[PDB]
Amino acid sequence: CTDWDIKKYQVLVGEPVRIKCALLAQSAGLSLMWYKSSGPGDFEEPIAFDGSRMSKEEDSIWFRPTLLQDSGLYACVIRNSTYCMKVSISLTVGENDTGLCYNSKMKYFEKAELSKSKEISCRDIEDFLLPTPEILWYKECRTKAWRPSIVFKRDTLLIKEVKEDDIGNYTCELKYGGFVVRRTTELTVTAPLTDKPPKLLYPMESKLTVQETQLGGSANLTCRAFFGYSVSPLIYWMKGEKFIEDLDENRVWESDIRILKEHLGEQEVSISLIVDSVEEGDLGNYSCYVENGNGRRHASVLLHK
Amino acid sequence: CTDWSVDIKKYQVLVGEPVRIKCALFYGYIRTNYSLAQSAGLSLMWYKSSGPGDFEEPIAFDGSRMSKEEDSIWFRPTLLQDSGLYACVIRNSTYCMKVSISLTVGENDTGLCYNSKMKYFEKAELSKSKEISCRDIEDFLEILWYKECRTKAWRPSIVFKRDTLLIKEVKEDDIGNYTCELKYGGFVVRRTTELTVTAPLTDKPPKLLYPMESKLTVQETQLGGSANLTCRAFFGYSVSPLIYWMKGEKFIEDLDENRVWESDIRILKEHLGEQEVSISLIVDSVEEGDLGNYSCYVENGNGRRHASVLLHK
Ligand SMILES: *[C@@H]1O[C@H](CO)[C@@H](O[C@@H]2O[C@H](CO)[C@@H](O[C@@H]3O[C@H](CO[C@H]4O[C@H](CO)[C@@H](O)[C@H](O)[C@@H]4O)[C@@H](O)[C@H](O[C@H]4O[C@H](CO)[C@@H](O)[C@H](O)[C@@H]4O)[C@@H]3O)[C@H](O)[C@H]2NC(C)=O)[C@H](O)[C@H]1NC(C)=O
Ligand SMILES: *[C@@H]1O[C@H](CO)[C@@H](O[C@@H]2O[C@H](CO)[C@@H](O[C@@H]3O[C@H](CO[C@H]4O[C@H](CO)[C@@H](O)[C@H](O)[C@@H]4O)[C@@H](O)[C@H](O[C@H]4O[C@H](CO)[C@@H](O)[C@H](O)[C@@H]4O)[C@@H]3O)[C@H](O)[C@H]2NC(C)=O)[C@H](O)[C@H]1NC(C)=O
Ligand SMILES: *[C@@H]1O[C@H](CO)[C@@H](O[C@@H]2O[C@H](CO)[C@@H](O[C@@H]3O[C@H](CO[C@H]4O[C@H](CO)[C@@H](O)[C@H](O)[C@@H]4O)[C@@H](O)[C@H](O[C@H]4O[C@H](CO)[C@@H](O)[C@H](O)[C@@H]4O)[C@@H]3O)[C@H](O)[C@H]2NC(C)=O)[C@H](O)[C@H]1NC(C)=O
Ligand SMILES: *[C@@H]1O[C@H](CO)[C@@H](O[C@@H]2O[C@H](CO)[C@@H](O[C@@H]3O[C@H](CO)[C@@H](O)[C@H](O[C@H]4O[C@H](CO)[C@@H](O)[C@H](O)[C@@H]4O)[C@@H]3O)[C@H](O)[C@H]2NC(C)=O)[C@H](O)[C@H]1NC(C)=O
Ligand SMILES: *[C@@H]1O[C@H](CO)[C@@H](O[C@@H]2O[C@H](CO)[C@@H](O[C@@H]3O[C@H](CO)[C@@H](O)[C@H](O)[C@@H]3O)[C@H](O)[C@H]2NC(C)=O)[C@H](O)[C@H]1NC(C)=O
Ligand SMILES: *[C@@H]1O[C@H](CO)[C@@H](O[C@@H]2O[C@H](CO)[C@@H](O[C@@H]3O[C@H](CO)[C@@H](O)[C@H](O)[C@@H]3O)[C@H](O)[C@H]2NC(C)=O)[C@H](O)[C@H]1NC(C)=O
Ligand SMILES: *[C@@H]1O[C@H](CO)[C@@H](O)[C@H](O)[C@H]1NC(C)=O
């Protein structure tokens, strides 16, 4: 039968899951089958349904609860006299690690700006909603008394003003017929957006630094700048109108950008310009260009002797 | 900059073994090499996010273990921390591209040499040859093979050739996890594969068990009653089993009463790829028209067999 899934399932052992065949079928005479492979290339064993945990319900399989055994590839096949279709679903079951409520490999991630609003939502909770709903939030796998600044509405968490204290793993809990559904997200805070172009440190914008090199010598011109949080940092060297790529590719080349420091999204990167076997043409005024969202700044270096 | 969400290539390694993460942009996406691209002034940076939504911190290498060598990153050895998403970015005045590579690091579980989630899989036919190879090994260029995480003396049926394991005749006993080991400068490289043996190709069409091919079984039902007609067959290894009910020329879908429907296929047994499935035909509020001869059709690659059932009373 025709063969091809992007949808992947991650769940903690002891939590209810619903796996759907990605593709009225009973009416058309179509017969539906599932296979568990547990790996790419495996036997794809036919599943004989029990009634306690694994339930064949409509277009889906229900696990109540899930077990470590359940981890694997699930292939849903539809069969007819002349018609067939099948698709494979990946289910990974893991256990919360050592006293924690969640699994390290299995969690969501978010980023927030200091002194700014941020919303945290309980994602992928649709399959347990009826009739048309209670949720509890944990901080570092512990119950907390939440400040009035933080507001809870309908499966979501809102922080009106975000502080450097509000960092870590946020896990929401749902009750599903004597079962718990946990979705955990980790928040990382960064400094707010710059609103200002980066700052040149070496060379400075208005000092006109001087570099001395002898002919047939080696020249190292190293720019340095500070990039506040705002894409990779854009810092590069130019000699007048000519870009680094244009001038004499055999003797002169540009180094890769280095990260001298990083904190809260702010970086202090440095890049260097290297010239070998320096000649009369190489001597002149070199400028380090630094650019971002709000501006383009540059400073100059003089090559002498 | 222009983005390629996630690279198909993913890395799975045991903690304490060497890994090499390759920037996909130089090998697959773009033909131009790192040595010639950098000449054009392109700058390369890496980021470690550990998640699709995380901060993506810029990594300052500065390490004995983590080495920025050309278009790749070297881990010698790898650590449990290293698990995450690695994004390589190329920078220009007006040009940018980035791609993300997934590295997953795990530890051998409870007295075992391997990780259950991280291993290869294979299938073999009984009494036939099958070769097991040490896959995706390179950048570390002799091999030694273990069976069930133990050193073994191998029969002349099993032969060793560089980077491969060959079994002339596969037997039902030689099933399980085969792990090859390589030594790379005081480090060990383990690649483990699991073998599952199945019965050889049928060469014969399936066999009807219930009803039998030439007995013409009879079921008695009263009018306004309930009818359960359950077929049963044996399918040897050869895809889902093709077994279905028919009433004369008409398929089950054709008569399409709200009263008569077909059940889903059930798996009564499984051994070595051989199945003995059963399907049932159900009729509710039986009427005079429903009475007649029903046939259960069973089919596979080499043949089509069928048996008949008579509905009476
Ligand atoms: C028309 O009539 C047919 C009868 O031919 C009905 O089909 C039967 O439906 C019943 C449903 O109750 C089936 O009963 C099931 O038996 C399965 C087989 O047993 C397992 O155990 C042995 C070991 O002894 C294994 O070797 C074997 O491979 C099986 O795995 C069970 O798996 C079923 O589920 C569970 O049952 C008990 C319930 O407490 C659990 O404790 C068990 O752990 C088990 O998981 C179930 O018991 C019966 O097999 C069917 N027969 C056939 C021939 O298909 C149709 O349903 C009916 N049509 C209707 C009503 O529309
Ligand atoms: C939920 O959110 C919390 C924070 O809100 C996260 O906490 C971090 O958890 C990780 C583990 O996943 C911690 O990493 C581990 O802890 C060690 C502590 O680091 C400090 O160590 C000493 C004090 O003991 C300090 O002096 C030092 O400056 C460090 O700040 C790490 O150092 C460990 O790595 C070390 O060990 C390995 C092997 O032993 C070595 O090879 C390494 O080189 C390294 O030395 C270890 O990885 C991390 O520290 C926690 N952060 C904080 C701030 O406490 C949770 O991770 C998060 N939940 C999940 C699932 O991620
Ligand atoms: C190649 O490598 C793979 C993977 O490493 C091996 O697959 C293993 O196969 C063995 C079979 O010999 C499996 O062993 C079995 O473990 C099961 C554990 O389940 C228990 O726990 C769950 C909850 O987590 C319960 O639901 C369940 O009822 C069990 O309690 C059990 O089915 C068996 O363990 C025995 O221990 C329990 C106590 O826990 C006893 O009460 C029972 O009597 C029971 O017999 C069974 O032994 C093992 O789990 C498989 N591993 C994985 C990861 O799937 C291959 O075997 C290996 N190849 C070769 C040739 O060895
Ligand atoms: C051109 O000039 C630039 C700037 O002057 C220069 O950049 C320098 O690069 C080197 C490495 O390529 C840096 O040296 C390292 O700095 C970091 C600390 O941030 C550490 O990794 C190292 O510290 C120790 O390293 C050794 C152990 O690995 C120790 O033995 C050693 O004693 C150190 O303690 C190492 O110092 C250097 O920091 C920068 N320069 C600046 C100012 O940051 C570049 O290399 C020059 N040449 C080119 C581009 O060809
Ligand atoms: C996070 O993971 C840990 C371990 O991975 C989970 O701990 C487990 O907790 C259950 C219930 O408390 C334990 O089962 C019970 O064990 C006691 C032992 O006396 C027994 O009397 C009970 O009848 C029941 O069987 C289980 O042993 C324990 N697992 C361990 C210790 O390895 C924990 O539940 C997970 N979730 C969290 C912390 O939210
Ligand atoms: C980074 O630098 C600039 C900014 O966009 C780009 O410059 C030019 O890009 C073109 C197409 O990518 C390059 O094509 C070449 O054209 C020459 C023409 O003589 C031809 O001989 C080559 O075979 C090739 O087709 C061109 O070299 C390049 N010019 C430069 C770098 O000076 C560049 O493409 C950007 N991106 C990179 C380098 O990946
Ligand atoms: C399992 O990993 C440990 C390191 O945590 C190592 O010492 C041990 O040798 C490994 N097992 C085998 C069979 O090599």
Author numbering:
A (entry chain B): 31 to 34, 37 to 55, 66 to 174, 177 to 274, 277 to 351
B (entry chain A): 31 to 171, 178 to 274, 277 to 351
Sentences from the paper on this structure:
IL1RAPL1-ECD consists of three Ig domains, which are arranged in an L-shape.
